Amino acid sequence: SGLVPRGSHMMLAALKEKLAALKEKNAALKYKLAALKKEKGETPELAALEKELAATEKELAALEWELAALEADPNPDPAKLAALEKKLAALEKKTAALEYKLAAL
């Protein structure tokens, strides 16, 4: 099997920390968003951003279950780990853009 088990073990740990950092970063945008909702009202723009945040929070919770099941697998599928890394990478980019967009409002 070579370095396949070691690569899966290292990628599992990297994705676990990546996901936990995304959960904290996305939850912190709730407080800034609610502050903007209080200051400006629940505008159509702020309402749409709240749905994005809620949807991102919902997906991170589901991907966390997927990561939990892969961590319990004695031989996790490297293809599932690679696909999970790609999803988290895209969620990182959406969260970074939402953070800059909330700071600009």
Author numbering: -9 to 95
Please give the exact wording used by the authors of the publication that reports this structure:
Given the underrepresentation of clockwise topologies in nature and the associated design challenge, we initially prioritised this configuration. To do this here, we used MASTER to search the RCSB PDB for loops to connect helices in the AF2 models for the clockwise, apCCTri-BĀN, and anticlockwise, apCCTri-BĀN′, topologies. Next, ProteinMPNN was used to optimise the loop regions of the single-chain models while keeping the helical seeds completely intact. Based on pLDDT and RMSD, two BĀN and one BĀN′ single-chain designs were chosen to test experimentally. CD spectroscopy of all proteins showed that they were highly α helical and hyper-thermally stable, and AUC experiments confirmed they were monomeric in solution. We solved X-ray crystal structures at 2.10 Å, 2.15 Å and 2.20 Å resolution for the two BĀN- and one BĀN′-based designs, respectively. This was done by molecular replacement using the AF2 models of the peptide assemblies as the search models. All confirmed the three-helix bundles with up-down-up topologies for the B-Ā-N/N′ helices. All had consolidated hydrophobic cores with knobs-into-holes packing between the core Leu residues confirmed by Socket2. In addition, water-mediated hydrogen-bonded layer of Thr (A) – Asn (B) – Thr (N/N′) was present in a clockwise design.
Here we describe the combination of rational and computational design to deliver three-helix bundle (3HB) peptide assemblies and single-chain proteins with control over topology and thermal stability. First, we garner sequence-to-structure relationships from antiparallel 3HBs in the Protein Data Bank. This gives core-packing rules, including layers of hydrogen-bonded polar residues, which are combined with surface-charge patterning to design complementary sequences for acidic (A), basic (B), and neutral (N) helices. Next, AlphaFold2 models for both designs are used to seed computational designs of single-chain proteins where the helices are connected by loop building. Synthetic genes for these express in E. coli to yield soluble, monomeric, and thermally stable proteins.
